């Protein structure tokens, strides 16, 4: 049962895991790089919000290619958890 969206999604994830494979250790209080199942984020300094271009696995990525998804890094040095503790982010720009 081919799922073309899933296959492209697995591709983006594979790509992100590696690219964060090379990047060298952080020199300050950060939020560890990660693939939060949506986008790949680098090591982000505490108390700062990170940005990324909308993921290309999205079917409408040609209409939101110029938009951004955001992910907040707390002063703790910890990424932001949604109510249930899952990976949290602002992908409003990227939505259909």
């Amino acid at each position: 049962v081919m799922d073309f969206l899933f296959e492209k999604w697995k591709l983006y994830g594979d790509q992100c895991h590696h690219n964060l494979s090379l990047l060298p250790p952080p020199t300050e209080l950060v939020c560890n790089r990660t693939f939060d199942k949506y986008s790949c984020w680098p090591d982000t300094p505490a108390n700062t919000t990170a940005n990324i271009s909308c993921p290309w696995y999205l079917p409408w990525h040609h209409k939101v290619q110029h938009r951004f998804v955001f992910k907040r890094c707390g002063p703790d040095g910890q990424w932001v958890r949604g109510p249930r503790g899952q990976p949290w982010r602002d992908a409003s720009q990227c939505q259909m």
Partner: antibody
Amino acid sequence: QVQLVESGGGVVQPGRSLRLSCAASGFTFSSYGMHWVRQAPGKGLEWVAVMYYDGSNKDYVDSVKGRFTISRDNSKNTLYLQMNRLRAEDTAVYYCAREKDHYDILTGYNYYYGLDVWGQGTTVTVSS
Amino acid sequence: DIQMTQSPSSLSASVGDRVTITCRASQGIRNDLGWYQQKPGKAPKRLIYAASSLESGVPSRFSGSGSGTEFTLTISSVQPEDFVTYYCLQHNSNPLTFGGGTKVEIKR
């Protein structure tokens, strides 16, 4: 054939620590989030802890934060609960529950469907 | 911390009557609410999930409704085995929070 069984309950004195276990069968253990729920002798239901797969997502009810630890051994489909520095408020029956989640790729949302399957439970009595 | 206010604590009913149990969430939880039945000496057993859905193998007399902040559990005609305790559970945010519970006792 999907079942949950909690064991390890008994009598333990305040200050000392106890470990609970929860065995699962009939379903794929790795694919679900597991909860602990307890109920004091004559009181209602209270949520205590929760792990998922990762286990990067563990949460606890306030009264047990820094006191209880939840963990899981997927090889033998078993959930654990470390109970430390026990006290009166811990006296209760402890259940383990199953919960399914779902990640929507297009949206990026994570959906949770609540606790659908419980175990019979096991009693913990803290007293000297 | 979402408070789950359940009413009433205990109610009065005769078998065949219509029973109504309400659950008010302090914070909006959409349809992430579920209802539970607990018989004395046994572990809880879900009846309603997603607020409005009926668990497989549960009498058609049990029905839940509502969304957001207000929820209701209904038994169109109470049955002799239905006279037991019921709990509502919110799985929207951590921590997971239950209602105080409702004990249904047969009236005489």
